[PDB]
Each structure stands twice: as C-alpha cells, then as structure tokens.
Coordinates of C-alpha atoms and ligand atoms in Angstrom, one line a residue:
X7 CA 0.0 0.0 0.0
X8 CA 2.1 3.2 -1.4
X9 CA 0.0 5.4 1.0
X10 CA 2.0 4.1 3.6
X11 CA 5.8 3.5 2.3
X12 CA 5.7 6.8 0.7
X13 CA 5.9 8.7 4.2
X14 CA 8.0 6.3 5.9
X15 CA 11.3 6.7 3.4
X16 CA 10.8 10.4 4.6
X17 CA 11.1 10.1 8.1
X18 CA 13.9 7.3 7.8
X19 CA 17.6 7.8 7.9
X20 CA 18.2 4.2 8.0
X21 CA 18.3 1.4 5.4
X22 CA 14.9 -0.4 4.5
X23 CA 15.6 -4.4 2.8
X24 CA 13.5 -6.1 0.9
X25 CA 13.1 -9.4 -0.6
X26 CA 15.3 -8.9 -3.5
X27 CA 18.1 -6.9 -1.9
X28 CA 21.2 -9.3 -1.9
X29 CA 22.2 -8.6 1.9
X30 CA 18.4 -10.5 2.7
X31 CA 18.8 -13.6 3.1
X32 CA 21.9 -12.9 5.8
X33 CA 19.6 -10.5 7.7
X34 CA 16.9 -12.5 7.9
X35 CA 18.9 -15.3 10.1
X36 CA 18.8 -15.2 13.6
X37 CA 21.1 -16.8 16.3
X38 CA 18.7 -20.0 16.3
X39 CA 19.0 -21.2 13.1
X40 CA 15.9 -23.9 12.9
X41 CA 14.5 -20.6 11.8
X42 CA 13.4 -20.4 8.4
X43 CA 10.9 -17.3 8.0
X44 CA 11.0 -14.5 5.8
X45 CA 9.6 -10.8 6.4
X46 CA 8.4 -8.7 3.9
X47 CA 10.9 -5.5 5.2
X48 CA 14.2 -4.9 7.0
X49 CA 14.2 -2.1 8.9
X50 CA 17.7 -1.0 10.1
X51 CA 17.1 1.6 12.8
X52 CA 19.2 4.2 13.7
X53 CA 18.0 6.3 16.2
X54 CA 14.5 6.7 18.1
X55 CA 12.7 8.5 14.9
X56 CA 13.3 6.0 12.8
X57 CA 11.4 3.4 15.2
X58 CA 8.5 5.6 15.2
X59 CA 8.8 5.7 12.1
X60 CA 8.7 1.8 11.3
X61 CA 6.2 1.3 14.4
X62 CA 3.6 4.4 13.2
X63 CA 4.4 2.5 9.4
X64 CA 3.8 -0.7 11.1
X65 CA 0.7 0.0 12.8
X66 CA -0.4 1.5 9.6
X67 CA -0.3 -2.0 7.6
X68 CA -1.3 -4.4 10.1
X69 CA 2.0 -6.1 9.9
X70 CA 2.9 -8.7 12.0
X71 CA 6.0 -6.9 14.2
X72 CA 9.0 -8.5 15.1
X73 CA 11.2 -6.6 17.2
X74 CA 15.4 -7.7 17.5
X75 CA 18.0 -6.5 19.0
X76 CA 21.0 -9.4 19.4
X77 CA 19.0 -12.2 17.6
X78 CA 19.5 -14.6 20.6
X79 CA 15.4 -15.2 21.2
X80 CA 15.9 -18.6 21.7
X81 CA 12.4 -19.3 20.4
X82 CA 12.6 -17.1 17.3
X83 CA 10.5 -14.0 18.2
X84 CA 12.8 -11.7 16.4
X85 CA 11.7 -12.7 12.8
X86 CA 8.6 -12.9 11.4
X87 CA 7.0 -15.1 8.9
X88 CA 6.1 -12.2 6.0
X89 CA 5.5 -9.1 8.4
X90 CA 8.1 -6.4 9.1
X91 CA 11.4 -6.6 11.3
X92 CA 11.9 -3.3 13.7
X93 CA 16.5 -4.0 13.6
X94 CA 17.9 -2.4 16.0
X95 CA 21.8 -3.6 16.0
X96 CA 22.7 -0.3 14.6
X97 CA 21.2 1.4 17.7
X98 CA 24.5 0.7 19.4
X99 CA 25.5 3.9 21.8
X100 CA 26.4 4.4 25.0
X101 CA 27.5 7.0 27.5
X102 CA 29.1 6.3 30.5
X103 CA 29.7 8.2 33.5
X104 CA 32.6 7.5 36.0
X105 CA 31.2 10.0 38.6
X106 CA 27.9 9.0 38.1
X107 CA 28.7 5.1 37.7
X108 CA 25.7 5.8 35.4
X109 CA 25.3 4.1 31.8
X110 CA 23.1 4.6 28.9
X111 CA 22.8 2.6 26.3
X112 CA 20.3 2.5 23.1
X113 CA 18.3 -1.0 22.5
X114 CA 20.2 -2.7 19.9
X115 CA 23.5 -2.8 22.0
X116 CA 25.6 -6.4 22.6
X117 CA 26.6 -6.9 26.1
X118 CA 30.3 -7.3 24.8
X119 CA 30.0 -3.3 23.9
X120 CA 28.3 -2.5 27.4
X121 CA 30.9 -4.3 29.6
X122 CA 33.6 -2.8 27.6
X123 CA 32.7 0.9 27.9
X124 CA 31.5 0.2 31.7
X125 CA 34.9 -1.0 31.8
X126 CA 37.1 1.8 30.5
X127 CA 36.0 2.8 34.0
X128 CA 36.6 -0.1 35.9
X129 CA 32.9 -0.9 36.7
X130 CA 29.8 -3.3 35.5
X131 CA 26.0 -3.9 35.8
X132 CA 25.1 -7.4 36.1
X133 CA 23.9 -8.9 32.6
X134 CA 24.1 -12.1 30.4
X135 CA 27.2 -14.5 30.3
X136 CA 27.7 -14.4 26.0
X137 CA 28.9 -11.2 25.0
X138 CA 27.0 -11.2 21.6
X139 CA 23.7 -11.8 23.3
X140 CA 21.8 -8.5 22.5
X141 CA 20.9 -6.3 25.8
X142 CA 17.7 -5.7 24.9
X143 CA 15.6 -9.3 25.4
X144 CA 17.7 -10.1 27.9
X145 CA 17.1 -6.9 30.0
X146 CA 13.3 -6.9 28.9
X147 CA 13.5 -10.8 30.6
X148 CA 15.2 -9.8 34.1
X149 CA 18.4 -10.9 32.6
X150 CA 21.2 -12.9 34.9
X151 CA 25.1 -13.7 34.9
X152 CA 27.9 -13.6 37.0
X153 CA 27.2 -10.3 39.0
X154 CA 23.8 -11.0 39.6
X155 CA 24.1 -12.9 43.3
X156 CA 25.8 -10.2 44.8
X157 CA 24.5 -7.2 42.3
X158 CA 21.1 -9.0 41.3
X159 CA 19.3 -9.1 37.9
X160 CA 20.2 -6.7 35.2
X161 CA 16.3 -5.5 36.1
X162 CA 17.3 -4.7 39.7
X163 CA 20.2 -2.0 38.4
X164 CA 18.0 -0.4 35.9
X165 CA 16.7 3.3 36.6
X166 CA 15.1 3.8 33.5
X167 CA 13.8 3.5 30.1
X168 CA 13.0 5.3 27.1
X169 CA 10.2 3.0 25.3
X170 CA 8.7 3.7 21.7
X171 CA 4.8 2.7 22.2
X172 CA 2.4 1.3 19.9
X173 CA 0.4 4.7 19.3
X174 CA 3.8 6.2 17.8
X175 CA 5.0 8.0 20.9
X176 CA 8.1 7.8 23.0
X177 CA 7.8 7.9 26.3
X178 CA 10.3 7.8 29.7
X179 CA 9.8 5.1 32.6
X180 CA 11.3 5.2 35.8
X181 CA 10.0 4.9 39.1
X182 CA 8.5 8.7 38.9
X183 CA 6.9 8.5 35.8
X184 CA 5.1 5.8 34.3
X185 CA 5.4 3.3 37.1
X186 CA 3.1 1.0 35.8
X187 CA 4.9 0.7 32.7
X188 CA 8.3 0.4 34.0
X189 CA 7.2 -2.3 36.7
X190 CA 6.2 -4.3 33.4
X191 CA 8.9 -3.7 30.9
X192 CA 11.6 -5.1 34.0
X193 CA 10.3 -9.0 33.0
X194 CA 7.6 -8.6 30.6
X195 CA 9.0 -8.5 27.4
X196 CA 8.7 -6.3 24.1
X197 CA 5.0 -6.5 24.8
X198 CA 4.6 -3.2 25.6
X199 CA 6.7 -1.3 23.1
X200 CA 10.4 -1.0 21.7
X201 CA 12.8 0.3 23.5
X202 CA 15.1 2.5 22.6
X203 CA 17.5 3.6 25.5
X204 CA 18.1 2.0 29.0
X205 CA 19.9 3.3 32.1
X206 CA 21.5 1.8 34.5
X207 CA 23.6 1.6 37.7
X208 CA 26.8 0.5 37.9
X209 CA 29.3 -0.7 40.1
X210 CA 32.9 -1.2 40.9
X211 CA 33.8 -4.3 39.9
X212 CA 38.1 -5.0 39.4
X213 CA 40.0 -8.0 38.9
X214 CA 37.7 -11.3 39.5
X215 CA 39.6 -14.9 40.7
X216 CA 37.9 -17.1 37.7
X217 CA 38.7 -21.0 37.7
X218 CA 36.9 -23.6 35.6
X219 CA 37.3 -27.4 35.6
X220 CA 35.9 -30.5 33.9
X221 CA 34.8 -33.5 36.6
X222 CA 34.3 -36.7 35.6
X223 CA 30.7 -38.0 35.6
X224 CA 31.2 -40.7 37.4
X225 CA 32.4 -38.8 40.8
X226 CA 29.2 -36.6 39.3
X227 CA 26.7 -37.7 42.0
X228 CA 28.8 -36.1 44.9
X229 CA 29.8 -33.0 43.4
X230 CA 25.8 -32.2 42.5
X231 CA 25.4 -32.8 45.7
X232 CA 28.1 -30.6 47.6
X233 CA 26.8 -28.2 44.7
X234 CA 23.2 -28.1 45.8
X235 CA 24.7 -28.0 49.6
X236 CA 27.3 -25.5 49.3
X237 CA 25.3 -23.1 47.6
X238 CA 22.1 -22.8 49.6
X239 CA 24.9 -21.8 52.8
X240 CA 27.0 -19.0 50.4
X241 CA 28.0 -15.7 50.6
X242 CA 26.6 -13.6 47.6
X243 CA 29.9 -13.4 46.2
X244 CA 30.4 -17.0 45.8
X245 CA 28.7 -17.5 42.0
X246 CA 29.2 -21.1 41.1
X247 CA 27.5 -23.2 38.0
X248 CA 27.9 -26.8 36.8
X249 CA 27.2 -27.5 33.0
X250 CA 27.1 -31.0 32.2
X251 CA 28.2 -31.8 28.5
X252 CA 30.9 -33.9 26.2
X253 CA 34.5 -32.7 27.6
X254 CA 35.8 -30.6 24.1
X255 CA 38.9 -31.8 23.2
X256 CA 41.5 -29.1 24.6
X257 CA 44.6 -29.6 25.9
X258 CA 44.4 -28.7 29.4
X259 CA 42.1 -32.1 29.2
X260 CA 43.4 -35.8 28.8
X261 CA 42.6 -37.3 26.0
X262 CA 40.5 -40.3 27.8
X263 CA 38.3 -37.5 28.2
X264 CA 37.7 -35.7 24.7
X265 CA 34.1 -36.5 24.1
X266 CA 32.8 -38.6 26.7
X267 CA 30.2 -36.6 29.3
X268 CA 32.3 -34.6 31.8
X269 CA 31.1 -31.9 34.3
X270 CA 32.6 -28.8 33.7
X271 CA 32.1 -26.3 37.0
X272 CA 33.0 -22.9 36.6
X273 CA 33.2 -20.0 39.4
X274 CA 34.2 -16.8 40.5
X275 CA 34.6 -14.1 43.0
X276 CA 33.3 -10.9 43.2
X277 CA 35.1 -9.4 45.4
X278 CA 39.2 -9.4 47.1
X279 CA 40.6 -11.6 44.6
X280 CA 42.6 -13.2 47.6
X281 CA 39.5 -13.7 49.3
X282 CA 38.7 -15.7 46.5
X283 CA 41.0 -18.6 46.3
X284 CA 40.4 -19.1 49.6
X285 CA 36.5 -19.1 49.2
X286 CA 37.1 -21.2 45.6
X287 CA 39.2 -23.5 47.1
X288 CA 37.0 -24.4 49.8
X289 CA 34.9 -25.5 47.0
X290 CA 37.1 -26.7 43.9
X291 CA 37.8 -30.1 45.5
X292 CA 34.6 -31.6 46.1
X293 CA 35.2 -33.5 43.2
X294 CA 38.8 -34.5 41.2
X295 CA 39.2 -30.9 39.0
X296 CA 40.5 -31.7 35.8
X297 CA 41.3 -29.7 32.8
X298 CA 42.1 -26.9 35.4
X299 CA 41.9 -23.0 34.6
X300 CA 42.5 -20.4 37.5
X301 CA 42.6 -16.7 36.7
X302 CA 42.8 -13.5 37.8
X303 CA 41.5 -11.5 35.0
X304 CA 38.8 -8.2 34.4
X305 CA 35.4 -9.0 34.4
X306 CA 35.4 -8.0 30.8
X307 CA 37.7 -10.9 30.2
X308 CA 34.5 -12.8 32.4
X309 CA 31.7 -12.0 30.2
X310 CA 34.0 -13.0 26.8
X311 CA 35.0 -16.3 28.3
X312 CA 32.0 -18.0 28.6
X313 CA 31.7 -20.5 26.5
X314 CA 35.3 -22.1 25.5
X315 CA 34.8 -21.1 22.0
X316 CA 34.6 -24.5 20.2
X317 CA 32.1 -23.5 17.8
X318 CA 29.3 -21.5 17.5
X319 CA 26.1 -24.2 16.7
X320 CA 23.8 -23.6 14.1
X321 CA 20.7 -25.3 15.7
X322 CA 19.7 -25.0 18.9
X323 CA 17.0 -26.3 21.4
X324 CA 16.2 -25.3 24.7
X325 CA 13.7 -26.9 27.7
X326 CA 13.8 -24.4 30.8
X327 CA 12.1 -23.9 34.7
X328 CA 13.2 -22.9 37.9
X329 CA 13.5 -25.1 41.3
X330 CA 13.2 -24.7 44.5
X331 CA 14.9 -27.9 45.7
X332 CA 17.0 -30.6 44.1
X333 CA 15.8 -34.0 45.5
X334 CA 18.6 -36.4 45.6
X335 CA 16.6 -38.4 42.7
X336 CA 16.6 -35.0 40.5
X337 CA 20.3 -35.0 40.7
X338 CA 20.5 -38.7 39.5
X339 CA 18.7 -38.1 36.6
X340 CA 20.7 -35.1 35.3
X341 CA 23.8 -37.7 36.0
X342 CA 21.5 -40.3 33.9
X343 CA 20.9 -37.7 30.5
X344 CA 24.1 -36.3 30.5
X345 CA 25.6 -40.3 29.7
X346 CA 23.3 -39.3 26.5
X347 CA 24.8 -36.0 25.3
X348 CA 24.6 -36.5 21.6
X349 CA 26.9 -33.7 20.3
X350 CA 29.9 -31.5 22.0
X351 CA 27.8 -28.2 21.9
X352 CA 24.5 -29.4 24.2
X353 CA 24.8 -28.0 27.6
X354 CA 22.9 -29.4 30.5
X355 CA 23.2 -26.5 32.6
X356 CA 22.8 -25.9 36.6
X357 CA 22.9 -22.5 37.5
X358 CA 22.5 -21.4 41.5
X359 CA 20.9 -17.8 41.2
X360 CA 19.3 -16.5 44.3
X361 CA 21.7 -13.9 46.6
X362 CA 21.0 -10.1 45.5
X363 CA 17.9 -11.3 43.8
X364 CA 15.9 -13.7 46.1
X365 CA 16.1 -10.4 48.3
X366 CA 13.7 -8.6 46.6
X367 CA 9.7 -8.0 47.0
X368 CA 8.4 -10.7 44.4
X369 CA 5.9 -7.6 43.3
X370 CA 8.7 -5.4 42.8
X371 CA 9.4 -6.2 39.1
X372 CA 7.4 -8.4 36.6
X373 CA 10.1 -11.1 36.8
X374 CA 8.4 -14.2 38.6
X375 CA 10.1 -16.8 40.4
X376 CA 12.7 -14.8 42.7
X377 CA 12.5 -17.4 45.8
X378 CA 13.6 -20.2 43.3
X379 CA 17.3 -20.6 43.6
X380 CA 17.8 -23.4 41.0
X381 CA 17.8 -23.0 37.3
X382 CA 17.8 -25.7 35.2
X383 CA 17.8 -25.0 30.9
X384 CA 18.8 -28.4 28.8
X385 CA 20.3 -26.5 26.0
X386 CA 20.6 -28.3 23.1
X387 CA 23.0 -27.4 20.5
X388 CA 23.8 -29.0 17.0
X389 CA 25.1 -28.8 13.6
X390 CA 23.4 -31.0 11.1
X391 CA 19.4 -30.1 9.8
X392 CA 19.1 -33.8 9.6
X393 CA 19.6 -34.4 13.2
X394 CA 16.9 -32.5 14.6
X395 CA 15.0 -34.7 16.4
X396 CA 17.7 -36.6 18.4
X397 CA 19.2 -33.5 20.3
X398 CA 15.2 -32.2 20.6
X399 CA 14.4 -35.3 21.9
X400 CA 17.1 -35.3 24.2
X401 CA 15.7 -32.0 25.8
X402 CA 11.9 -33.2 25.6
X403 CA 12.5 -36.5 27.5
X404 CA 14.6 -34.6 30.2
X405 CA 12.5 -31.6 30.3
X406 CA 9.5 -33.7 31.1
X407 CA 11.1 -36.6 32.8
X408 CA 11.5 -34.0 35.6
X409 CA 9.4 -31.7 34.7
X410 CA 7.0 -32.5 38.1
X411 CA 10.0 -31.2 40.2
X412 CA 10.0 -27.9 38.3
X413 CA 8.3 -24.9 39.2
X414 CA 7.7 -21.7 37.0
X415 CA 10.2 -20.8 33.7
X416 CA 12.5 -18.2 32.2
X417 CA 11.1 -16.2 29.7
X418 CA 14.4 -16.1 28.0
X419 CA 15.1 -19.4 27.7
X420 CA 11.5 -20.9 26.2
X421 CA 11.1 -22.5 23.1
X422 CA 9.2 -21.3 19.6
X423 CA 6.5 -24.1 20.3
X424 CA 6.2 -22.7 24.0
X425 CA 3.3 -19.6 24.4
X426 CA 1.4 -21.9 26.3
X427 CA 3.7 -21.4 29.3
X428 CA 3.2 -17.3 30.1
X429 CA 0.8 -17.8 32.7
X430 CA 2.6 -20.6 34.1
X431 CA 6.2 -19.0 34.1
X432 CA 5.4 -15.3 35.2
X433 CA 1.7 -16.5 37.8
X434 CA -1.9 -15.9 37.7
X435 CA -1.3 -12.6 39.9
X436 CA 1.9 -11.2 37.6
X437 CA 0.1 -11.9 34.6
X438 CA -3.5 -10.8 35.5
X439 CA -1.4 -7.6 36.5
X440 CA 0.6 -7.9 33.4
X441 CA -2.8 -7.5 31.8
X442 CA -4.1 -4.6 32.4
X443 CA -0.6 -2.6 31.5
X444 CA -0.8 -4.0 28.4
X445 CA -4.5 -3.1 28.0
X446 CA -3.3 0.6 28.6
X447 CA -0.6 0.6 26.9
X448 CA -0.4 -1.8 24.0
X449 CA -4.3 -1.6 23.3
X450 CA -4.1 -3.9 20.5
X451 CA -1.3 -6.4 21.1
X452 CA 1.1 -4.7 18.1
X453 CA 3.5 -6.7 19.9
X454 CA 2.6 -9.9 19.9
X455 CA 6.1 -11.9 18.8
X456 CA 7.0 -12.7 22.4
X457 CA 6.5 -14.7 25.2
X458 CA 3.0 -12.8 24.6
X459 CA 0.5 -11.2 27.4
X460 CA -3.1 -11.2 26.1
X461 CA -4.9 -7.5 27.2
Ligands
FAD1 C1 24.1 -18.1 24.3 C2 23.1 -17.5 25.1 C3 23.4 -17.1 26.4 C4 22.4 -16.5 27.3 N1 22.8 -16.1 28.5 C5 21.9 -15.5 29.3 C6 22.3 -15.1 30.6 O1 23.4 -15.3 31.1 N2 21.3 -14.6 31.4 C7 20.0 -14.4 30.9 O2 19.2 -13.8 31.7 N3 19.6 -14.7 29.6 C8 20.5 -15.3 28.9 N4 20.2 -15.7 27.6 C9 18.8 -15.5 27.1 C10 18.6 -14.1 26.5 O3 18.4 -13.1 27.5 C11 17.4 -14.1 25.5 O4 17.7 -15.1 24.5 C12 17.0 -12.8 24.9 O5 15.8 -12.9 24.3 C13 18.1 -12.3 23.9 O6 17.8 -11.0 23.6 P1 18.2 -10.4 22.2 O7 17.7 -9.0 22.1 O8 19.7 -10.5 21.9 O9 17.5 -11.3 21.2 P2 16.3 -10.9 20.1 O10 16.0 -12.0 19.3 O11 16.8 -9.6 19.4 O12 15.1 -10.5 21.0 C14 14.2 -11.6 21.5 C15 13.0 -10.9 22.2 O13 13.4 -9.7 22.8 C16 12.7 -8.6 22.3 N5 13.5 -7.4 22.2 C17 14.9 -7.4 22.0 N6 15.3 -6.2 22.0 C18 14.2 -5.4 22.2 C19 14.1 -4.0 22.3 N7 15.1 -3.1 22.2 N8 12.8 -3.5 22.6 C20 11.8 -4.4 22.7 N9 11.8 -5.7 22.6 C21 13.1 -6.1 22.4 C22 12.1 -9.1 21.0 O14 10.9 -8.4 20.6 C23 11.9 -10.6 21.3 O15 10.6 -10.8 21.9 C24 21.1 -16.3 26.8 C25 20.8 -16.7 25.5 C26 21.8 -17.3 24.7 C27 21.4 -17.7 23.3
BR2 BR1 6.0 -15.0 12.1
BR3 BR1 26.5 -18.8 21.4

C-alpha cells in the first residue's frame, strides 16, 4: 500500500531491505537457526525517529512486528513469517559516567559493547554470560550472569527506560513516571513497546579470581550434591554453576576424556581476589578438577570467556524452569541424561541464582520466580538439519522426565512451540497484572512476537 511506504522513506535515515536486496537472506537469520521465516521489510534503525517511524508504518499496515536486537530469542521472536522486522543492532551507543557510575545505552547494543565501555571505568552492571547476546531481550527478561548474586538481575540495576509505544509516541519510565509501565517492561517482554534507551547503575567491579574445571561424571553424584549444599549456605559473592556436557577436546584435558560426558564447573569471586582462592578452594575439590583453569583477570575478560569457543552451533534447542529444591533423585537423573549428550555443543546447565535477587519484594518487578534458587535449561546445540529430532528429543524426554519437580520458567530461555507457558512462568497474579498494562498501553497487542500477554 504506497499510502504508507511513501511517508516512511521520509522520516527514515536508515536502510529499509526487501526481498530482493542481496544482503536479505543474511539479515533474515537469527542466532537459532531452525528458523526459516521470511519478512516482507528490513528495517535498520538508527536512532528513536526511525522506530517511530517503522512502528507508526507498522501499525499502519497491520503487519505482524517482530522486534530484535541481538538475535538470541531462543524461540525465534525476532523474525517474522512475512511481516516487518523493527532491527535495532545499529542502535549501538552508549554514555558512560565514571562519577555518576551511570550508563546509557540505546536498545540494539551487545553486552560485549556494554561491559567494555562500563569497563574503561573499571565498573559493571550485572547482565548475560555471551557477549553477543543482544541487551535488549535479555534486560526486557530480568536478565542474569555472574554479578547477579551479589548485584542481582540486570532488572534490579535499571533506573530507566525510554520506550517507543504502539500509538507512535516515545515515552520515559522510571520509578516517577510511568510506574506502571516500568514495573512491566523489567520481565515482561517487548509487549509493551520498543525500547530504545536503558539506564543503569553501575558498580565497581576490578579484577575477579575465575577457575573452571571438567569432573568426571562418574564422581558426578557427589559434586551435584556438595553443589546443591554448598550453595544454599553461600555468601553472595560466591557464584558457582555446573554444565554437564561432552568434555571438548582441549589440551588442558586428557585425551581419555575428549568426548565422553564430563562436568565442567566454573566460578568466580566478586570481590578481594585473595579472598577468593580461599573461598574457591574451599569449593574446587569436592570433586577431582581436571582440565584446570584459575585466573585472575577483568570482568570484561569474564563476560567474553564463557563458553570455550569450540564452535558457534547452528541449531539449537532449549527446555527451561526454575527449582526450588534438588531431590537427591533429581540430581541422578541429570547424571542419567548427560551419559546421553549426543553432540559437544549441548549443555545441560545448573545454574545457582538466588543472593541479591531472592532479596527482593516478588511484586517489585514483573520477573516471577525470585525465591527459586535453581535454574535448570537443557540446551541443546547441534550442527546438522538432519539431526533434529535426536538432540530435541534429548531435551523433551529430560525436560519432562522431571518436569513435576520444576516450578515456573524463564522467559528467555523458552522454546518457539512454548506460548502456552506465560501464565505458568510469570503467575496468575503477575500476569493478571501484566494484563491490564498492556490493555493501557499496547491496546491492541502490536507486539505480539514474544513470550506474549493477552490484554
Ligand atoms: C548463548 C546465550 C546465552 C544467554 N545467557 C543468558 C544469561 O546469562 N542470562 C539471561 O538472563 N539470559 C541469557 N540468555 C537469554 C537471552 O536473554 C534471551 O535469548 C534474549 O531474548 C536475547 O535478547 P536479544 O535482544 O539479543 O534477542 P532478540 O532475538 O533480538 O530478542 C528476543 C526478544 O526480545 C525482544 N527485544 C529485544 N530487543 C528489544 C528492544 N530493544 N525493545 C523491545 N523488545 C526487544 C524481541 O521483541 C523478542 O521478543 C542467553 C541466550 C543465549 C542464546
Ligand atoms: Br512470524
Ligand atoms: Br553462542
């Protein structure tokens, strides 16, 4: 409809690209590349009028919106299937303040480019663990990594927003204006507009004491267990994680290991680096540590080491939900799925969140599930097109053959096939309240390509 398009090229510095446009079929592909769907329009945002542009445009065609920043929507909500893409990873500055410890950073940004301007001035805000993740679903999810037990979610450092809303307006959202909205946006999603700029604390945050080892899974049993134990009686600087997977085949690891299921346990410090090889030691050696790595490095050196680069997959496949125990049963059938790891890339992966963030009102932000400290996500991870159902089997029949000891879910870790699970994951109460911002605010549900909230 020309009626439309004509106006939009005038208020649009960016680049628009079609179907026919040789860079297409390269923009098109996201992170999870079981992802075969084709929009209609590239937009390549630049700055907060081009989104009003696209979103007035988009409104103004009924096109079916999906928004992206880093590509990482593990369930493919940042493509669409013939409607129009809002691009943001050209919206990619940020101002820092060392006075302040106050950052700012538009919606299309990496975390790789946030820790590393935070870090010019030797400070952080808790975010994700991959540096190419994009900052905006992950913030828009509550978002979690290796600050987060003594700093808390990326959600719990955020001041405020500037959000482009499905009337065409821009708006500002912090705890004195628009409270309603900003309570929603911290866990909800893209469902109630785009954002375009985020603001956050920050704090100092030097050298960390890093080590990383690969147990064997036979010894597996105990070290879940001293895992599960040791954490629920830690400080909040303690952040420790066990991902269960086939050892890689690096030379810090004996051979008699490359391939075969291993447990690979990586922590850190945040705080006195000396402080910490006390505190790691103390845990290192519940198990045998081979393939060891100790480090005293920045915590921009943190956020790129994760995970030891073998490859980046092309397929991937994800079952999530949060625990609130880990019944010594649980813990032998992790052990009993991880003697099944199909390829090197899968992950089964125990994280221990709680510290920073379980101390928080669960009605303070729209991210449910605070007093659940454990975090389970079988990742799965592969190369080959024709092996799709054996690694998404692999997650199904350990998703569900636990899946009565689960609680809840993370947003940011659900599946394409998964919309069935928004009341579950966030609560009758969150999302009955969830309701009625997006009633105000997104009238219509323009944004509907997300772990979507019904008004
Ligand atoms: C390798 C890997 C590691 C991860 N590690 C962590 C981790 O440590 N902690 C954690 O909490 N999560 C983690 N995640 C999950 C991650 O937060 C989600 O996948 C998130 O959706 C990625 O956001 P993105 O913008 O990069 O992806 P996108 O595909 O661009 O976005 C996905 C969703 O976010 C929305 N969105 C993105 N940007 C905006 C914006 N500016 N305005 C409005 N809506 C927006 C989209 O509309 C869509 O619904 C990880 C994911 C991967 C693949
Ligand atoms: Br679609
Ligand atoms: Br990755």
């Amino acid at each position: 409809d020309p009626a439309t398009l004509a106006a939009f090229s005038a208020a649009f510095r960016g680049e628009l690209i079609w179907p026919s446009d040789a860079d297409y079929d390269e923009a098109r592909r996201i992170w999870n590349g079981t992802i075969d769907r084709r929009p209609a329009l590239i937009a390549r945002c630049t700055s907060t009028p081009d989104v009003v542009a696209a979103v007035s445009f988009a409104r103004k065609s009924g096109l079916l919106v999906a928004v992206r920043g880093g590509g990482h929507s593990m369930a493919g909500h940042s493509v669409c299937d013939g409607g129009i893409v809002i691009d943001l990873s050209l919206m990619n500055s940020i101002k820092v303040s060392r006075r302040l410890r106050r950052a700012r950073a538009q919606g299309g940004c990496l975390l790789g480019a946030f820790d590393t301007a935070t870090q010019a001035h030797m400070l952080a805000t808790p975010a994700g663990v991959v540096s190419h993740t994009g900052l905006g679903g992950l913030v828009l999810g509550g978002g979690f990594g290796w600050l987060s037990r003594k700093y808390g979610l990326s959600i719990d450092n955020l001041t405020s927003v500037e959000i482009v809303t499905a009337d065409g307006g821009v708006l500002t959202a912090s705890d004195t204006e628009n409270p309603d909205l900003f309570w929603a946006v911290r866990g909800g999603g893209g469902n109630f507009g785009v954002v375009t700029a985020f603001e956050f604390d920050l704090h100092r945050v030097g050298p960390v004491r890093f080590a990383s080892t690969y147990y064997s899974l036979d010894e597996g049993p105990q070290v879940i267990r001293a895992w599960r134990d040791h954490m629920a009686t830690a400080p909040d600087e303690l952040t420790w994680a066990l991902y269960l997977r086939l050892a890689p085949p690096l030379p810090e690891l004996p051979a008699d290991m490359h391939g075969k299921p291993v447990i690979c346990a990586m922590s850190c410090w945040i705080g006195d680096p000396h402080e910490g090889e006390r505190q790691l030691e103390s845990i290192l050696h519940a198990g045998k540590p081979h393939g060891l790595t100790k480090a005293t490095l920045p915590y921009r050196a943190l956020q790129a080491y994760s995970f030891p680069g073998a490859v980046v997959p092309d397929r991937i496949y994800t079952k999530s939900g949060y625990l609130n125990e880990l019944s010594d049963e649980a813990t032998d059938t992790v052990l009993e799925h991880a003697a099944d790891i199909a390829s090197p890339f899968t992950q089964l992966e125990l994280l221990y969140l709680g510290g920073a963030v379980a101390r928080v009102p669960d009605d303070a932000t729209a991210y449910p599930n605070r007093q659940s400290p454990f975090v389970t996500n079988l990742a799965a991870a592969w190369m080959d097109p024709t092996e799709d159902a054996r690694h998404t089997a692999w997650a199904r029949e350990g998703y569900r053959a636990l899946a009565g000891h689960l609680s809840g879910g993370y947003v940011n870790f659900m599946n394409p096939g998964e919309a069935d699970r928004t009341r579950e994951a966030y609560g009758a109460a969150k999302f009955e309240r969830l309701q009625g911002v997006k009633a105000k605010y997104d009238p219509t549900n323009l944004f509907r390509l997300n772990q979507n909230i019904p008004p």
